[PDB]
Write a protein that binds this ligand. Structure first.
Ligand SMILES: CNC(=O)NC(=N)Nc1ccccc1
Length: 309
């Protein structure tokens, strides 16, 4: 079972090459493309990577100043190291801030997909768009849509997967990151109507189905079961489900963090019930895990031992 984590939005983060050297980590999601074309200057998507990148943004063939970052030099340098180390690197779409971003048509969702594929996918001839990370090719795209409904996303997923299928030699990945409440307002249409390789339900910040509601069953009702049942119905039936967790008490709202012993008792129960769908743990996020050093190692290292034990 696999350990996925988020990097990109950590206060004072170290550079991604620190995390590339963390052997426990099998997947790293880079957040975020957070400005969508429909409300962003030029219809270009924009990006934000916390402290990373020199602050420069592309301007278009029209002189339009965009929201995309053009000098992300450490990330370009660092994504190949991660991949040279066995790790899959997915570029994440959305995130928490700002909360006023969405997709308005099926056309803009095909264009959004196509722009990301040209931009961060394989190097391609006729592509006359940006290459924010140079000749690096990501392994996939993560959908962390946490605002404004689910319109457009199954289309973006199938459009992506349409593109994947032309590169038969290489294997590319689609994941999503719902919150616990079923149905997820952002991603249930996506999950149902398209094939996600991985899905990591965020089990923090919502009381009625939080991971901590497994340890304290008075807080809400941990619902991984209901989720295996919808997954079975869906176009993502072969998706691997992940229990999404905060890597430190200071990573999500108070009381969502579980101690390793609490995690283990979650994991050994749901790895055994659904050995065929259970996939692993996902952490929010990389920096909080760094700073949560338990006996000379970070939180993620202790998660991986749990999964192997
Ligand atoms: C994988 N996505 C996240 O972990 N999202 C997340 N933590 N969003 C967020 C929502 C409200 C406040 C802070 C962060």
């Amino acid at each position: 079972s696999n350990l996925a984590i988020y990097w990109g939005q950590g206060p004072n983060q170290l550079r991604l090459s620190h995390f590339c050297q963390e052997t426990s980590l099998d997947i790293i999601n880079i957040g975020f493309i957070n400005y969508f074309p429909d409300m962003s200057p030029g219809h270009w998507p924009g990006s934000n990577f916390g402290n990373q990148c020199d602050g420069s943004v592309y301007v278009t063939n029209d002189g339009v100043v965009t929201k995309l970052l053009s000098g992300c030099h450490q990330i370009m340098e660092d994504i190949p190291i991660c991949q040279a180390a066995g790790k899959k690197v997915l570029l994440s779409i959305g995130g928490a801030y700002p909360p006023d971003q969405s997709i308005l048509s099926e056309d803009s969702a095909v264009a959004f997909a196509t722009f990301l594929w040209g931009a961060f996918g394989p190097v391609a001839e006729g592509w006359e768009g940006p290459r924010p990370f140079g000749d690096v090719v990501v392994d996939g795209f993560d959908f962390d849509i946490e605002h404004n409904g689910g319109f457009g996303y199954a289309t973006m997923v199938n459009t992506f997967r349409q593109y994947f299928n032309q590169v038969p030699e290489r294997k590319f990945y689609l994941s999503a990151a719902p919150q616990c409440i079923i149905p997820d307002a952002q991603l249930s249409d996506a999950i149902f109507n398209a094939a996600f390789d991985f899905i990591w339900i965020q089990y923090y910040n919502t009381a009625a189905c939080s991971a901590k509601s497994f340890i304290d069953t008075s807080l809400g009702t941990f619902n991984f079961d209901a989720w295996v049942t919808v997954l079975k119905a869906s176009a993502s039936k072969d998706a691997k489900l992940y229990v999404g967790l905060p890597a430190s008490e200071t990573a999500a709202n108070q009381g969502y963090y579980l101690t390793p012993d609490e995690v283990e008792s979650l994991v050994s129960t749901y790895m055994d019930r659904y050995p065929d769908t259970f996939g692993g743990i996902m952490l929010w996020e990389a920096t909080a895990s760094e700073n949560n050093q338990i006996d000379g190692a970070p939180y993620a290292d202790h998660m991986k031992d749990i999964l192997l034990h």
